[PDB]
Amino acid sequence: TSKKKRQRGSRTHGGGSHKNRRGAGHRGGRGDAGRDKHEFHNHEPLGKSGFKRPQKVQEEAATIDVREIDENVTLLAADDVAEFRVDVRDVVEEADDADYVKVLGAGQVRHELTLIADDFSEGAREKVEGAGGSVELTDLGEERQ
Amino acid sequence: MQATIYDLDGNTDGEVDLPDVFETPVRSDLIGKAVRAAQANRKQDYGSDEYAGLRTPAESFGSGRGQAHVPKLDGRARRVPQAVKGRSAHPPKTEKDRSLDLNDKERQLAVRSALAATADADLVADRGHEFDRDEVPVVVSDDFEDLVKTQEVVSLLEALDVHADIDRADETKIKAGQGSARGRKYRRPASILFVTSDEPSTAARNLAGADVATASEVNTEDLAPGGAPGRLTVFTESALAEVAER
Amino acid sequence: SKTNPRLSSLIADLKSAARSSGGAVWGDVAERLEKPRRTHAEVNLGRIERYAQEDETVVVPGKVLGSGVLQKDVTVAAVDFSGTAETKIDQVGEAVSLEQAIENNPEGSHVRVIR
Amino acid sequence: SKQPDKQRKSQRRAPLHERHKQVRATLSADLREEYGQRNVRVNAGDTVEVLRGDFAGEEGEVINVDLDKAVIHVEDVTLEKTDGEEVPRPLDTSNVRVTDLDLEDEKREARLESEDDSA
RNA sequence: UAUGCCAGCUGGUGGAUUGCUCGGCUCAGGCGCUGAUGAAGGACGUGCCAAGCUGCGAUAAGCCAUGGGGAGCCGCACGGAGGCGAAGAACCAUGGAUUUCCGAAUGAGAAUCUCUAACAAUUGCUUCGCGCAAUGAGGAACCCCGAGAACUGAAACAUCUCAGUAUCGGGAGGAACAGAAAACGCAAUGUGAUGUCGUUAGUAACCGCGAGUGAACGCGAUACAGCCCAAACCGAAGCCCUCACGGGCAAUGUGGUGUCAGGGCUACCUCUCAUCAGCCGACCGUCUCGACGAAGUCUCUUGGAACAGAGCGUGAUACAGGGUGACAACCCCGUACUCGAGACCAGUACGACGUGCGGUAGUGCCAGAGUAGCGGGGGUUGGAUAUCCCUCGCGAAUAACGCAGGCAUCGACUGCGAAGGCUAAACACAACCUGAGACCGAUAGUGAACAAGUAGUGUGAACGAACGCUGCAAAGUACCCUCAGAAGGGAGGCGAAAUAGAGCAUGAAAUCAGUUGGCGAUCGAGCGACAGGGCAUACAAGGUCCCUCGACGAAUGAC
RNA sequence: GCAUGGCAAGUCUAACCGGAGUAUCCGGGGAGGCACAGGGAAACCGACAUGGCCGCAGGGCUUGCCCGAGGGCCGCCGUC
Ligand SMILES: [Cl-]
Ligand SMILES: [Cl-]
Ligand SMILES: [Cl-]
Ligand SMILES: [Mg+2]
Ligand SMILES: [Mg+2]
Ligand SMILES: [Mg+2]
Ligand SMILES: [Mg+2]
Ligand SMILES: [Mg+2]
Ligand SMILES: [Mg+2]
Ligand SMILES: [Mg+2]
Ligand SMILES: [Mg+2]
Ligand SMILES: [Mg+2]
Ligand SMILES: [Mg+2]
Ligand SMILES: [Mg+2]
Ligand SMILES: [Mg+2]
Ligand SMILES: [Mg+2]
Ligand SMILES: [Mg+2]
Ligand code: NA
Ligand code: NA
Ligand code: NA
Ligand code: NA
Ligand code: NA
Ligand code: NA
Ligand code: NA
Ligand code: NA
Ligand code: NA
Ligand code: NA
Ligand code: NA
Ligand code: NA
Ligand code: NA
Ligand code: NA
Ligand code: NA
Ligand code: NA
Ligand code: NA
Ligand code: NA
Ligand code: NA
Ligand code: NA
Ligand code: NA
């Protein structure tokens, strides 16, 4: 049995005095009325903040952490093995509607990896080299200067 | 497990491997959910006229004449819900979404589960079906798809000791209630489901309580009418094989 | 108000075992499965690999998921495993149903609970 | 039309020529065999036998056929009025069987015999 | 024991209840314009007797033809009389005839009539004559173009919001509108007419930066289709009316060419399968309608009636639904299967006829002006400097030019040619046809199951109800008595039932008549709850209860 | 938010398309959404698959002593 189902006979259906459930006055005004007065509590403050650059001057990087690549090297049997060598661009999803692919360095690298991507973070490089690996910058990656 | 194939005389004729799906653990809660959705999804939208009871300029006189403040016209009350001829306060509405969603996986699982319930003689007996057989479902040669006369499917069924179920479904019930005024006067037990491969069995369809289906599109409802698992079914050699991949 | 008849039976079986046999885990696992689904365990392989040890059966009072890497040769018992989890685990160890666990070990000894 | 209201309506409002089908009766075993039809439109010339009313068992010649009320008057199938007069008791052709046919019409007989049309 | 209280019984009043559904409500598929050749609507007529409704129109519930249909019929409407139909009526389909008056209403006037040949009025053509034509008005909503609130929200209120909503003016179609880039701008080595659906996204943008408001490109789909002028260069090679003769139009340019795969011109190359014009002209599908269509009306029992129970038997590519004296696959309609017709798809697709596509080089020959653009003032929009539009003023270039790419200018780059025009299909609505339903079931559901936009109210605009059910069959009560009596009553008759007897199935409560039990003319008022006594009670569906004694015997506990 | 159920580092399809027993239903459709990394107005940069300590349940042991998921207290890391 539901709460609603048990209201018949209660007269007020849980609203308290029958003088309560009337119009918007019982809500302190329609919608966000009073967000600056009687109901300012828990509303983000009034005001303008910052600016936005035009949508078409924005670049969206397609990222991936080494942890993800590394945890599935063996599993990526359909990808170069050598002295592994993986082209990140072929791993990352959303790597099409992306302005470029970037490898981030979260997690560990327990294998020797040769990574090819449009960009890398210090942490990603240090980790990939520290595990006896290398990081190759793509042609698009030739945008560093 | 093994599946004893039968010929059109009802005599054993070799046997095939009962596909794995018939081992899918029986989940009556999921089966029930699948049937519930299929039943909801074919219900039609309805609702009273948006303006029923509002076609009037009736007005309230207010205080002054020892009368309740009720809109009246020509000295007759109108519009308000407590008024005879007034609007329906919270009526059925066309806009209401009367359909039920169901994840494909949850649904397909229910299909597999209802399939499996079909291979359990005890379940099939509890569902209510009448029969004197130990093996189930009943598998038959693809030649069944060539039968043309209902009577012939009858003999085959009597030979397979399964005709008793049709005897069961050979009784209509004249329902209590006003469904009768809307064309729902009768209802009857569900009997044997015949699953073929090329086309539903035209020869078996008119049998009392029988339903015909095809392996590629047989669903939870025909496999478990009203959400109850374990329908006395009869597959076709090929049908049995197709169902395997569902 | 559980709906799954199987989950329901598992729960009753877990109890029968904690009562009859000297088990305490089974009753513990039973009480957690009785609690709301949102509280049931959802463990990835990375956690099993970090706290499990060989010859000690890992017991998940919920479901095991496939993220991370498992190398240890352990036996994991859970309510269910995702398809990938069960595949990765059987390559280095063994994925087992809580129903089998209760049978091969109704006393629930040498078990490690992971959530 | 599977809806009861529509079924009854189309039966009650059927135009005159669509009402002939409402005054049809099953034929005797002999007649069925003779013409290859299970029933016929009872005519005011045929002889018929009552199979269901209080008059079940009696036989007589059809005296009248009313299309609008889809009913027939069979000779001697009557009711005793208060004044003593004897009036016909309307019968539904559905409770009647034709044992003899009035074939004075070339057209009716033709229809009966052909195998692509029924009378 | 008057007046009277409480409960019940018999009869009534009333019309709830249950059962029933000729009506609604909603969804879906199909289809879709009518009118000066006088529509839609209205008025008045029209029947043997005819008031209402329906139909019809002085040929008036109809006339004719063809096809279907069939032995009956003369609408709803079952009377009386009379008639029609084998000379094939009724009835249905298609086509035709007739079709009064008012009505856009058009010769003129007028509350449906009247006065002395009439496209009134405005237009095009024009034989300049109403000679040939057009417009007008209607339609359920949908559609397009204009005019455009306020209550309300912001807890007041002015911008904002309600809302470009309600409402008003103009107008089209079966669908409208839009539409082959002076586009987009995931900026690109990219996309490629237009609607619409899903999403993009409550994102960008707007806003007393409050409340609120609110796209687009793209993407996935649906459906797909692309073309014609103006001009250059030609220059009467042309078009309309008429059978013809003949007339009219046209150098202020008819017609040829041509239209960013730029074109023209000159010299060449190749070639046509583009396009445009015209001819023919569907299949399938879908919607509706129609033909044919299997198998019991056997036994016994109950019953007024078998469609019930028991028994025996049958069909099924048909066990949807309905009807028939009660629960019917086999009694009747129908239903499955097969087949036929009309409509829509569509004057479309296909096919074919004619035309001729395209490429090179040269050439500043051609290419839409109050325009592009700027300024003042407003409206509108998410459009912010960067929406779209109006108004007043100003105002350019000529492809070697010009516009756009979300502030302005200059250069670069990329895209694209405004100020001429057309365009199928996919999408909206629901009048109309059909189908459907966990919708309602006569105070519900439409206002409307009935005389329903009826009766009735208001000067008018406008407002606006209630009313469903005898019975299997009318067998709808003959005869007699009574009476002022075709009333009513008595007796009687029919039927299973008249307590089914006419607004007649069932027949609640409030409540009324008579009557039964209890109380009752010396007595006190929330009408009762719990205890306990009187009196009252057919059965059934409850069967217990009383007293002696004895057994057990908590707390408590004596003379 | 919560309860139940499917699947799980993923999950779900929308419009729509095909089939069919033709509004149900079977198959297809991942466009796109949310989740999988955050911080910053922006430019732009880009994280613990565990380093230490308490310790509930549970497990272990020679019965206080170990191991102790979750939980708790710290360290440490990304960014402004
Ligand atoms: Cl930004
Ligand atoms: Cl985890
Ligand atoms: Cl694009
Ligand atoms: Mg109403
Ligand atoms: Mg009922
Ligand atoms: Mg015949
Ligand atoms: Mg006039
Ligand atoms: Mg206000
Ligand atoms: Mg304010
Ligand atoms: Mg707005
Ligand atoms: Mg855009
Ligand atoms: Mg031309
Ligand atoms: Mg505005
Ligand atoms: Mg009503
Ligand atoms: Mg007045
Ligand atoms: Mg009555
Ligand atoms: Mg995508
Ligand atoms: Na409350
Ligand atoms: Na209240
Ligand atoms: Na408020
Ligand atoms: Na304030
Ligand atoms: Na009204
Ligand atoms: Na009053
Ligand atoms: Na809906
Ligand atoms: Na139409
Ligand atoms: Na009349
Ligand atoms: Na006419
Ligand atoms: Na005219
Ligand atoms: Na003239
Ligand atoms: Na206010
Ligand atoms: Na005020
Ligand atoms: Na504002
Ligand atoms: Na894209
Ligand atoms: Na009958
Ligand atoms: Na201006
Ligand atoms: Na542009
Ligand atoms: Na009524
Ligand atoms: Na996707």
Query: Do A83 and A96 reside in the same domain of the chain?
Result: yes
Amino acid at B186: Y
Number of domain units in chain A: 2
Question: Residue B113 and residue B20: Cα distance in Å, rounded?
Answer: 11
Residue B21, CA atoms < 13 Å, CB-side half-sphere: 17
Residue of chain B whose Cα is closest to the Cα of C6? B27
Q: Which residues pair with B187 in a beta bridge?
A: B173
D5 CB-to-strand E distance under 7 Å: yes
Contact positions of strand F to protein Cβ (< 7 A): 2-13, 19-21, 23-27, 29-30, 32, 36-37, 41-50, 57-61, 67-70, 78
3-state helix, strand, coil split of chain C in percent (to 5) is 45, 25, 30
> In Å, what resolution does this model reach?
2.4
Instruction: Show which subunits contact D, needing at least 3 CB pairs below 8 angstroms.
Output: B
C-alpha dihedral sign at D25, D31, D35, D36: positive
CATH number at residue A84: 3.100.10.10
The tokens for A57 are 């001057």
The verdict on A92 and A37 lying in the same domain is no
Inter-chain touch C4–B29, beta carbons under 8 Å: yes
User: What is the enclosing helix (H) or strand (E) of D111?
Assistant: helix D106-113
Distance, CA of D90 to C1' of E317, in Å: 39
- Give which of C58, C66, C62 is closest to C91, Cα–Cα: C66
Same domain, A140 and A122: yes
**Which residue from B119, B125, B132 is spatially nearest to B243, judged by alpha carbons?**
B119
Q: Rounded to whole angstroms, how far apart are CA atoms C95 and C81?
A: 8
Place of tokens 């012939």: B152
From C109, C46, C114, C106, select the one nearest C76 (Cα to Cα).
C114
CA-to-CA dists, residue B118 to B29, B137, B193, B212, angstroms? 16, 6, 10, 15
Domains, chain B, ranges and CATH? 1-246 (3.40.1370.10)
Question: A31 exposed, middle or buried (CB, 10 Å; 0-12, 13-18, 19+)?
Answer: exposed
Q: Which domain holds residue A27?
A: 1-50
Note whether A45 and A63 are same-domain residues: no
Residues A32 and A34: their CA atoms lie apart, in Å, by: 6
Tell me if B196 sits within 8 A of B144, measured CB to CB: yes
Helices (H), chain B: 28-40, 104-117, 121-126, 150-159, 163-169, 220-223, 237-243
* Chain B residue nearest residue D4, CA to CA: B183
Domain ranges of chain C: 1-115
H-helix or E-strand spanning residue C34 = helix C25-34
Could you give the angle at which helices B28-40 and B104-117 cross, rounded to 10 degrees? 120
Domain shared by A35 and A83, yes or no: no
Residue A54 CA to E384 C1' — how many Å?
A: 12
CB-based contact (8 Å) between B183 and chain D? yes
Q: Are B157 and B193 in contact (CB under 8 A)?
A: no
Q: CA–CA separation, C5 vs B229, rounded Å? A: 14
The answer to whether the C-beta of D18 is closer than 7 A to strand E is yes
Q: Do D3 and B182 form a contact (C-beta atoms < 8 A)?
A: yes
Q: Does C36 touch chain B (CB under 8 A)?
A: no
Phi-psi map region of B20: left, alpha, beta (phi>0 left; psi -120 to 50 alpha): alpha
Interface present between D and B (3 or more CB pairs within 8 Å): yes
Q: How many CB atoms lie within 10 A of CB B196?
A: 24
Contact call for residues C115 and C62 (beta carbons, < 8 A): yes
CA B45 to C1' F22, in angstroms, rounded, equals 19
Q: How far is CA A103 from each of CA A59, A93, A109, rounded to the nearest angstrom?
A: 16, 13, 13
Contacts of B183 in chain D (CB under 8 A): 2-4
Proximity of residue D3 CB to strand E below 7 A:
yes
Do residue A46 and residue A56 come from a single domain? no
Containing H/E element for B194? strand B193-196
Per the entry, the structure determination technique was X-ray
How far, in Å, CA of A56 to CA of A53, rounded? Answer: 8
Query: What CATH number is attached to the domain comprising A46?
Result: 4.10.990.10
Asked if A121 and A89 sit in the same domain, the reply is: yes
DSSP assignment string, C66-92 = --S---S--EEEEEEE-HHHHHHHHHH
What structural domains does chain D harbor?
1-119 (2.30.30.30)
Largest CA distance in chain D: 50
Question: Which residues have CB under 8 Å from C66's CB, separation 6+?
Answer: C44, C45, C82, C83, C84, C85, C87, C88
- In B, which residues are within 8 Å of C3 by CB distance? 29
- DSSP helix/strand/coil, D2: coil
* Cα–Cα distance measured from residue B171 to residue A127, given in angstroms and rounded to the nearest whole number: 78
Helix (H) or strand (E) holding C96: strand C94-97
* Residues A38, A21 share a domain: yes
Shortest distance between the Cα of B228 and any Cα of chain C, in A, equals: 14
- For residues A116-128, one letter each, b for 16 or more C-beta atoms within 10 angstroms of the residue's C-beta and e for the rest, the string is bbbbbbeebbebb
Q: How far is CA B186 from the centre of its chain?
A: 15
Last residue of a domain, one of A32, A50, A68: A50
CATH class assigned to C1-115: alpha beta
Residue D41 in tokens: 């439109």
The answer, yes or no, to whether B and C have at least 3 beta-carbon pairs within 8 Å is yes
